[PDB]
Design a protein around this ligand. Structure first.
Ligand code: W4M
Ligand code: ZN
Length: 299
């Protein structure tokens, strides 16, 4: 069977919240079968526990925020993308502050931390959610859609309001094999335009931003000394974001996501619309990994 996965070992990181500028201590702890990904704030008493689920999303401005009462965990999208990409089912994420650290602005550092700690296969079938029918949300010219697909595929188009490298649009389609995430998506950094960033900074937002954790685009050219990691790093980063939001379903998807200008807010609306449309999906397991539509890397 395709088995659930957790971490072999506890692993620890430190970093800064890009939004908050706060120093945060991050601990990833192994968890047992059918735990899911569960966030908790170690700096509160009592400690509060928030499953990484669509129903616990409270804010979607610039990032996905988990909320339970007045306790928040901000910027979950990059870490959840790493845990989706590697097929982690079960883990505790323990934070000393209200925001996941930004690291280098990609999922790369999280993937390496997880893959260092090692993956542990567990004696329980991994659960998948199979898209059996098309489900779409729109807001003006923005679109997000789930369509049936025997595997996992993301198609994404961004549409800037001015040309960047001579075009307003950037498109990528990734049909995921076991290695696609690590090779072609995980290293894609977050980005902003210099005028947007200066405005955000003025409003006391993006207090942990730097060239070390974000691509800065000064109108139509990249400011960062060493340039881009991928030709279309920007759309690859939006694919990373969508993968992190998708994992809030709490099980791995069999199907295709297609986004046109779809950010955390519309991605979250698509999740809620899919969940409400129960005839469009079904939970499934694969007792034979060899006949499954998805395969993960060896543990
Ligand atoms: C979780 S990130 C999010 C998208 N997002 N939301 N807010 C963001 C802010 C930034 C930033 C920035 C930044 C600020 C200051 C500097 C330094 N200065 C520059 C040059 O001049 C002087 C020195 C550098 C860079 C980048 C991405 C952002 N996201 O991907 C959600 O998914
Ligand atoms: Zn992002």
């Amino acid at each position: 069977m395709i088995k659930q996965r957790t971490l072999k070992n506890i692993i620890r990181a430190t970093g800064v919240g890009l939004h908050s500028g706060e120093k945060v201590y991050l601990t990833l702890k192994p968890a047992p079968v059918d735990t899911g990904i569960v966030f908790c704030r170690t700096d509160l008493d009592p400690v509060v526990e928030i499953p990484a689920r669509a129903e616990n999303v409270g804010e979607t401005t610039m990032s996905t925020t988990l909320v339970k009462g007045d306790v928040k965990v901000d910027t979950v999208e990059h870490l959840l993308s790493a845990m989706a990409g590697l097929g982690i089912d079960n883990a505790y994420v323990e934070l000393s502050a209200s925001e996941v650290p930004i690291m280098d602005g990609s999922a790369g550092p999280f993937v390496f931390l997880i893959q260092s700690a090692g993956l542990q296969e567990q004696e329980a079938a991994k659960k998948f959610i199979r898209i059996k029918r098309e489900v779409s949300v729109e807001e003006g010219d923005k679109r997000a859609v789930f369509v049936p697909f025997d595997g996992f595929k993301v198609s994404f188009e961004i549409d800037f309001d001015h040309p960047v490298f001579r075009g307003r649009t950037q498109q990528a389609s990734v049909d995921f094999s076991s290695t696609s995430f690590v090779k072609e998506v995980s290293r894609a950094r977050t980005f902003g335009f210099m005028r947007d960033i200066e405005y955000l900074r003025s409003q006391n937002l993006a207090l942990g931003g730097s060239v070390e954790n974000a691509i800065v685009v000064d109108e139509n050219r990249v400011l960062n000394e060493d340039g881009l990691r991928y030709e279309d790093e920007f759309v690859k980063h939006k694919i990373l974001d969508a993968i992190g939001d998708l994992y809030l379903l709490g099980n791995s998807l069999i199907g295709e996501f297609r986004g046109f200008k779809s950010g955390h807010a519309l991605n979250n609306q698509l999740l809620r619309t899919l969940i409400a449309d129960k005839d469009a999906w079904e939970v499934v397991t694969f007792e034979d990994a060899r006949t499954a539509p998805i395969s993960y890397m060896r543990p």
